[PDB]
Design a protein around this ligand. Structure first.
Ligand SMILES: Nc1ncnc2c1ncn2[C@@H]1O[C@H](COP(=O)(O)OP(=O)(O)O)[C@@H](O)[C@H]1OP(=O)(O)O
Length: 124
């Protein structure tokens, strides 16, 4: 089975690119990371930082998760991220996305030993 930590890396980590490279970035990425296999995932965020940097967030600012749990943490510094929003004209299996680059603080939920990121909660 794919572990929770590995799933987070697959759905959210992209250190190979410093920013949202192109307008076609989300269409290629959502497809290659298997996020459109069962249906079109409406929104998803990719983080362009090292794995070490994102893992360190688990020891940063503790904040409440959107779901009410208390295992969420916000990064002290802004990070390069790319938001993918499914455009209305998107129709499974032809999923379509709008690529958007930004620099914001990320909020992730952490779990386990080692305490690592397992879910992307929000960007602020
Ligand atoms: N407070 C929280 N809020 C939301 N999801 C949480 C959470 N704490 C943990 N999760 C995890 O985050 C995963 C997030 O759902 P998902 O795997 O579809 O990812 P994402 O939310 O990043 O798109 C859940 O399977 C759950 O896995 P773990 O139980 O393996 O951590």
């Amino acid at each position: 089975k794919e572990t929770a930590a590995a799933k987070f890396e697959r759905q959210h980590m992209d250190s190979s690119t410093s920013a949202a490279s192109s307008s076609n970035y989300c269409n290629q990425m959502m497809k290659s990371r298997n996020l459109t296999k069962d249906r079109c995932k409406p929104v998803n965020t990719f983080v362009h930082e090292s794995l070490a940097d994102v893992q360190a967030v688990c020891s940063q600012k503790n904040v409440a998760c959107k779901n009410g749990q208390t295992n969420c943490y916000q990064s002290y510094s802004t990070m390069s991220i790319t938001d993918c929003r499914e455009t209305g004209s998107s129709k499974y299996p032809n999923c379509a996305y709008k690529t958007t680059q930004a620099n914001k603080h990320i909020i992730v939920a952490c779990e386990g030993n080692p305490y690592v990121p397992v879910h992307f909660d929000a960007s602020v």
